Amino acid sequence: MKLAVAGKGGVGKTTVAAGLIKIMASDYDKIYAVDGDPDSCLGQTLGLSIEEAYAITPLIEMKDEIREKTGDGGLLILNPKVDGDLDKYGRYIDDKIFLIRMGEIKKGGSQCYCRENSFLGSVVSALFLDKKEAVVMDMGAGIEHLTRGTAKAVDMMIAVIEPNLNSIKTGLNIEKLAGDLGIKKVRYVINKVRNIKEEKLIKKHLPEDKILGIIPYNELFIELSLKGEEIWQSTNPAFVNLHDIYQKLRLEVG
Numbered sequence: 001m002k003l004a005v006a007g008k009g010g011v012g013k014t015t016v017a018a019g020l021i022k023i024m025a026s027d028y029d030k031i032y033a034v035d036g037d038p039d040s041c042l043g044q045t046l047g048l049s050i051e052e053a054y055a056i057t058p059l060i061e062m063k064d065e066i067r068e069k070t071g072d073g074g075l076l077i078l079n080p081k082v083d084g085d086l087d088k089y090g091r092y093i094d095d096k097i098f099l100i101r102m103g104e105i106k107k108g109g110s111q112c113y114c115r116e117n118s119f120l121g122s123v124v125s126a127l128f129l130d131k132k133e134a135v136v137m138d139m140g141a142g143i144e145h146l147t148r149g150t151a152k153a154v155d156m157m158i159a160v161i162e163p164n165l166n167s168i169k170t171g172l173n174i175e176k177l178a179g180d181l182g183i184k185k186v187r188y189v190i191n192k193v194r195n196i197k198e199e200k201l202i203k204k205h206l207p208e209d210k211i212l213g214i215i216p217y218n219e220l221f222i223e224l225s226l227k228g229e230e231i232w233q234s235t236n237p238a239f240v241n242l243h244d245i246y247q248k249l250r251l252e253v254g
């Protein structure tokens with residue numbers, strides 16, 4: 001199974017991705033947790049300490065492997081090859097979850113251009129097309145990491161939104177981009193709903209079949225965030241919601 005989780009920053013996109021990763025880590029023998037969003041740490045949210053996460057060097061910073069994979073000094077390999085060498089780009093969090101941190105993309109200007117991007121692209125592409133084990137990658141609303149090439153391999157794009165017009169619009173934006181790109185399934189996860197009014201607002205703009213589930217606002221996510229980190233276990237009343245979301249998710253995929 002290949003999943004993409006997108007959402008504007010602050011919507012709780014990383015928290016949702018981590019939750020799904022935690023829950024599906026028992027239906028698969030391995031899962032590629034891919035942090036495609038620099039602004040938030042999928043690693044820490046997954047339970048890693050700020051030290052263990054930093055140590056897992058970001059794809060964008062493997063300046064040597066980038067030079068070697070895209071040819072150096074002489075050649076230039078427009079199509080870097082990366083497969084068996086994936087497990088060298090991350091760390092196993094445990095016997096099931098392998099984490100890869102993309103690292104922030106750049107643009108610069110006529111200096112050291114396009115190389116590293118073809119590197120990350122190769123990784124993403126290999127993860128979705130060449131690899132067979134479940135993959136769950138989170139990303140911002142721009143879903144910049146996906147391409148028509150990989151889009152065909154994405155079983156589902158999960159748009160995480162909050163219960164308000166703006167955010168709902170962003171969700172719809174994501175649905176458009178994902179669609180244009182060729183992803184067949186785009187489902188929503190409304191996070192941080194605080195009252196019933198919000199739930200109604202949601203239903204008034206989004207169809208029922210397009211909604212995976214709702215996650216209530218909960219102080220726990222804030223407390224566990226900066227101490228326990230085990231923010232996703234029976235201990236959390238929101239886990240019931242994740243279970244529902246996940247179950248509904250597998251009903252549509254496989």
Ligand SMILES: Nc1ncnc2c1ncn2[C@@H]1O[C@H](COP(=O)(O)OP(=O)(O)O)[C@@H](O)[C@H]1O
Nearest residue numbers: 009010011012013014015040192216217218221
């Ligand atoms: N359902 C929720 N209820 C309360 N707080 C939440 C909830 N989901 C996420 N949060 C908080 O939202 C903040 C941003 O989460 P993250 O998932 O890191 O955001 P993004 O990935 O949207 O930048 C985190 O501090 C997280 O604890």
